[PDB]
Amino acid sequence: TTPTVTVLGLGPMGQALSRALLDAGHTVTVWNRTESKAQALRDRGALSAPTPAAAIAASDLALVNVVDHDAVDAILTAAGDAPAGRTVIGLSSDTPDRARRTAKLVGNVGGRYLDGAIMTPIDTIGTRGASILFAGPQALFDEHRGVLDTLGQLTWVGEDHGRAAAFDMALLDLFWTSVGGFGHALMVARANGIEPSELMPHAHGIVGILSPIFTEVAQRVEDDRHSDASASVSSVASSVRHLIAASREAGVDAGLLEAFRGYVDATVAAGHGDDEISRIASEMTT
Amino acid sequence: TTPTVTVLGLGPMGQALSRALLDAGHTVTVWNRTESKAQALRDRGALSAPTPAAAIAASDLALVNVVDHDAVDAILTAAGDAPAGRTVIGLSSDTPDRARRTAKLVGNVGGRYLDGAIMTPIDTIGTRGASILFAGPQALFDEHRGVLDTLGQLTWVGEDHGRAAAFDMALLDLFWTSVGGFGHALMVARANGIEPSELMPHAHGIVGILSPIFTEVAQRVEDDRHSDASASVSSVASSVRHLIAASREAGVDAGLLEAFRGYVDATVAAGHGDDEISRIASEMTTLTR
Ligand SMILES: NC(=O)C1=CN([C@@H]2O[C@H](COP(=O)(O)OP(=O)(O)OC[C@H]3O[C@@H](n4cnc5c(N)ncnc54)[C@H](OP(=O)(O)O)[C@@H]3O)[C@@H](O)[C@H]2O)C=CC1
Ligand SMILES: NC(=O)C1=CN([C@@H]2O[C@H](COP(=O)(O)OP(=O)(O)OC[C@H]3O[C@@H](n4cnc5c(N)ncnc54)[C@H](OP(=O)(O)O)[C@@H]3O)[C@@H](O)[C@H]2O)C=CC1
Ligand SMILES: CCCC[C@H](CC)CO
Ligand SMILES: CCCC[C@H](CC)CO
């Protein structure tokens, strides 16, 4: 009558997943390599299991939320034949080939596998603000959607077990590159007498322009249409040099902007200085 | 009564500025090094002037919107004494020390100077979605704010003529780094059979999580508070390796992520793997600790 779910991995995100499943009223079994991280959840109604095999054998569905697929696959090695007749969902960020290999590891012991990628922070889990992408057999996603729906908005992205991970590689590239730019910006600003609290209203303004700019860049890349520029490659080839000089003056490394400059300069050298900045990423090939 | 404004520089942003000032009912004079670029604005009601001196002498306020301060200073040199008794606003992105240099060039010929930085794209200009930062004498900003308010939301950031540029250097760093990430992401997604149109709903979701994350990282940096992590440095140290491997496999250079990894790895090596990702940027220093 009541669905069973196991969560293996009780770092910040695995705690968040466990609390959401417990609030939904599922029977939740938890396991972590560092055992005592389960204690806060046992106080909230979770059941612990002492080993990965015992944890997976307790439920129809096991979610594995750990640092990477070396950790996932180590947990599956320890679990042995426990996945047989059960479903494993990988929720551990790694490459598409690791998601496919882990699918194979689970199938070769008689389990079924979905791969997922959580694209939102812990505060969002258990709300309509969370976004989780899934890949693998459509029917298996449909079979477990009822339990998984309490976690957030789910999107199935394809049959290929690696496809959620492929989205994750692209989306986390955008995310972490932006985070690197933000932390750099705060360092250089602070060296110029602008504390983070004073910058932040304006930094929110920059975040506010990204969606419409990205929409246009994506459309231009699909159209292969880089003409009629509103902001040219030659203009940013001038600007990025200023930004690097400012970094240098402040004693802050400029490696992200230096990499960017290399692409911009290669676009100018290729004869596309007059084109929209949608052209620059072409020069990232090699 | 009717305000007089000159725009010097008719690239895409100078055209946008000029259209917004004309749409507001101002008396707009325009000048560009390449004179043919003035025709569409003359049809909208702009006056054109043949030289920078004649352009600046036509108006109480001159906006200079060109690629950099080497171009600004070449235009103001050509204008000679035309700025005397008038106000020049630089709207051309460059360093704080170039903004201060240009301020002194204007003051040398008896003009007044504000430096400004436009922080939004051409479509926003003339709307409440635009943002322009200004630096220089507060009273001079106040004198011209009624004309300038037709371009967008305005922020005066202080009396030092370099200070709008200092914000610009920080904010464009964030912006272009993010654009570099985005263009890279599209190329790696395409190699993996995900076209830009299929990625974009999800990319908008990532943009949607940045502001609260940035607000937290800024508070932690101010507080020097990197503990009780919800996303640890050790975790991103693993993640960024995956990202770089995926770039390699797609035939795409991973320079930006490689640079980030070096900071992440240095933070782990400093014994801060369990800390929040707010700690990473410390390792960007090139100063002796
Ligand atoms: N935190 C977040 O906001 C988000 C996280 N994610 C993803 O969720 C996953 C988990 O993230 P998060 O909770 O932050 O934690 P981490 O990525 O820091 O992973 C820590 C967890 O992995 C376990 N682990 C590490 N190595 C091994 C191993 N060899 N064997 C067994 N378990 C191991 C840890 O066990 P122990 O406690 O014993 O050290 C702990 O449970 C990651 O893949 C991350 O990318 C996705 C979106 C957001
Ligand atoms: N486009 C945008 O969305 C935004 C632009 N900005 C800033 O606004 C400024 C203008 O941007 P944008 O319109 O895109 O154009 P560009 O940065 O490409 O600059 C082009 C303008 O500069 C002029 N110019 C270049 N070199 C010289 C020179 N030596 N002497 C005289 N004029 C010269 C060009 O003249 P000519 O026509 O004869 O070549 C043209 O008018 C830049 O500093 C930019 O960073 C700010 C926010 C957004
Ligand atoms: C600092 C929070 C990071 C969450 C992010 C979600 C895409 C990466 O794991
Ligand atoms: C691609 C449009 C670029 C606008 C940007 C505004 C901060 C930089 O000039």
Numbering used by the authors:
A (entry chain A): 3 to 288
B (entry chain B): 3 to 291
Sentences from the paper on this structure:
In the early 2010s, Mitsukura et al. discovered, purified and characterized NADPH-dependent imine reductases (IREDs) from Streptomyces strains, a new enzyme class capable of the conversion of heterocyclic prochiral imines to chiral amines with high enantioselectivity. Crystallographic studies so far indicate a close similarity in the overall structure of these enzymes. They consist of an N-terminal Rossmann-fold and a C-terminal helical domain, connected by a long interdomain helix, and constitute a catalytically active dimer by reciprocal domain sharing. Out of all the IREDs we tested, the S-enantioselective IRED from Mycobacterium smegmatis (S-IRED-Ms), a member of the IRED superfamily 3 (SFam3) first characterized by Wetzl et al. in 2015, proved to be the only one capable of reducing both 3-thiazolines and 2H-1,4-benzothiazines with promising activity and excellent enantioselectivity. In order to further elucidate this, we present a high-resolution crystal structure of S-IRED-Ms together with its cofactor NADPH, the first published structure of an SFam3 IRED.
The S-IRED-Ms monomer, represented by subunit A, consists of an N-terminal Rossmann-fold domain of 160 amino acids (9–169) and a C-terminal helical domain (201–294) connected by a long interdomain helix (170–200). The dimers are generated by reciprocal domain swapping, where the end of N-terminal domain A, the interdomain helix α7 protrudes and inserts through a hydrophobic channel in the C-terminal domain of chain B to then emerge and continue as the C-terminal helical domain of A, which contacts the N-terminal domain of subunit B. The cleft formed between the Rossmann-fold domain of subunit A and the helical domain of subunit B constitutes the active site of S-IRED-Ms and is a large channel at the dimer interface with two separate openings, presumably for individual binding of NADPH and a substrate, respectively. The electron density obtained after molecular replacement allowed for unequivocal placement of five NADPH molecules in the asymmetric unit, one in each S-IRED-Ms monomer active site. Apart from hydrogen bonds to S232 and S237, NADPH only interacts with the N-terminal domain. The nicotinamide ring is held in place by interactions with S232 and stacks against M15 with its si-face presented to the presumed substrate-binding area of the active site. The second entrance to the active site in S-IRED-Ms, situated between the loop connecting the β-strands β6 and β7 of one S-IRED-Ms monomer and the loop connecting α-helices α8 and α9 as well as helix α8 itself of the other monomer is characterized by a strongly negative electrostatic surface potential, largely due to D125, E218 and possibly to a lesser extent P214 and S232 outlining the entrance.
